[PDB]
């Protein structure tokens, strides 16, 4: 937040530092998509775990009724 | 799972616990009946002989009619 | 949800069945012991008096040792 | 994505376009934070459902022990 | 003493009668409560899919065997 | 006969015993179910702030008479 805006302000007006600053934006965006990626797959895993547990309980109830 | 198997195991155990208790109940009720049959025959013998005032028969009568609190109508 | 609830309900019914059976067994055993204690005491009385050869007690002794 | 890299290319050398491009990045940073926050809520919700199911089951197993 | 015997027999009859009265009243209260528990159970079963943690607690109470 | 009076006295004592056993068990069963209603009431009271219409139906069952 404080890291970002300050760099956006440096680039408002003109410069070898601007290449260094834009690279800092490039890497941050990188670390943004990758953090979002880790989150999307946490969701997919939680969904998987949930589904399997329901399946296991439903299946156990069927088995219990056949016993 | 192990957790689902543990459920099935305990359900089997609970059904077995019930069956074992019913076995105990049925057997004890049969013995009870066998014993009660003897006590009734003995009561009838004591009743026939009440006029004799035999102290040994009257003691048997008190045993027959006792409860967990002891003799009914003490002495 | 439904499956977990049904499993819990089943376990409860099995537990209640077990406990009703145990109650029945305990009561049957108590009744049996009540009658058995009487016969054992009557047996002791007959054994006190075994010598006097009483025909009434002999009838009682024959009942004690009779078999189904 | 492909659009963000082109804006970092564009901003490398110099007024109307450079300010307009930073406002894109100012919107996109907050927009990335907003989207992450929304997803984190989807994770938490799903983990809360998973935990509720496990806790139900854990407690059932404990009760089962005493029967 | 015959008087003492009459008195005792009357007391034993009254004691039995009081206890039968207690039993009948407790049985009626028990049926009334059991009826409420069954109605509560019906309500819980309707909301099974909602996965409500409060109703899950109530269901655990309904099917508890610990006295 | 005294035998008949003793036999009757025994029967009265055993019937008294049976009746008391029955009352004790009935009271135990009643307390079991009542204990559940009370636990459910406490759960409802804890969650009163939620304004849950489902919980309200349950509360209406808890406090119903006859
Ligand atoms: Cl008495
Ligand atoms: Cl479930």
Swiss-Prot record, chains A, D:
It comes from the Viruses. Belongs to the phi29likevirus scaffolding protein family. Homodimer. Interacts non-specifically with DNA; probably binds DNA in the early stages of DNA packaging. Scaffolding protein involved in the icosahedric procapsid assembly. Coassembles with the capsid proteins to form the procapsid. The scaffolding protein is found within the capsid as a serie of concentric shells. During DNA packaging, the scaffolding protein molecules are released from the procapsid. This is Capsid assembly scaffolding protein. It comes from Bacillus phage phi29. The chain holds residues 5 to 46 of 98 of the full protein.
Curated annotation (Swiss-Prot), chain E:
The modification N6-acetyllysine is found at residue 36. Acetylation at Lys-36 by KAT2B/PCAF promotes dynamic kinetochore-microtubule interactions in early mitosis. Residues 48-67 are annotated as: Interaction with SKA1. It is found in: Cytoplasm, Cytoskeleton; Cytoplasm, Cytoskeleton, Microtubule organizing center, Centrosome; Golgi apparatus; Cytoplasm, Cytoskeleton, Spindle. Residues 36-58 are annotated as: APC-binding. Ubiquitously expressed. Belongs to the MAPRE family. Plus-end tracking protein (+TIP) that binds to the plus-end of microtubules and regulates the dynamics of the microtubule cytoskeleton. Recruits other +TIP proteins to microtubules by binding to a conserved Ser-X-Leu-Pro (SXLP) motif in their polypeptide chains. Promotes cytoplasmic microtubule nucleation and elongation. Involved in mitotic spindle positioning by stabilizing microtubules and promoting dynamic connection between astral microtubules and the cortex during mitotic chromosome segregation. Composed of two functionally independent domains. The N-terminal domain forms a hydrophobic cleft involved in microtubule binding and the C-terminal is involved in the formation of mutually exclusive complexes with APC and DCTN1. Homodimer. Heterodimer with MAPRE3. Interacts with DCTN1, DCTN2, TERF1 and dynein intermediate chain. Interaction with DIAPH1 and DIAPH2. Interacts (via C-terminal residues 206-211) with APC (via C-terminal residues 2674-2843); the interaction inhibits association with and bundling of F-actin. Interacts with CLASP2, DST, KIF2C and STIM1; probably required for their targeting to the growing microtubule plus ends. Interacts with MTUS2; interaction is direct and probably targets MTUS2 to microtubules. This is Microtubule-associated protein RP/EB family member 1.
């Amino acid at each position: 937040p404080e890291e970002h805006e300050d760099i956006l302000n440096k680039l408002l007006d003109p410069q070898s530092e601007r290449t260094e600053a834009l690279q800092q934006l490039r890497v941050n965006y990188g670390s943004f998509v990758s953090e979002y990626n880790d989150l999307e797959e946490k969701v997919a895993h939680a969904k998987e775990e949930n589904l399997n547990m329901h399946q296991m309980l439903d299946q156990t109830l069927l088995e219990l009724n056949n016993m | 799972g192990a957790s689902m198997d543990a459920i099935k195991k305990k359900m089997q155990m609970l059904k077995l616990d019930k069956e074992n208790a019913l076995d105990r109940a049925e057997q004890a009720e049969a013995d009870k009946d066998f014993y009660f049959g003897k006590l009734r025959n003995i009561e009838l013998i004591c009743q026939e002989n009440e006029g004799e005032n035999d102290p040994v028969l009257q003691r048997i009568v008190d045993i027959l009619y006792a409860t967990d609190e002891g003799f009914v109508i003490p002495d």
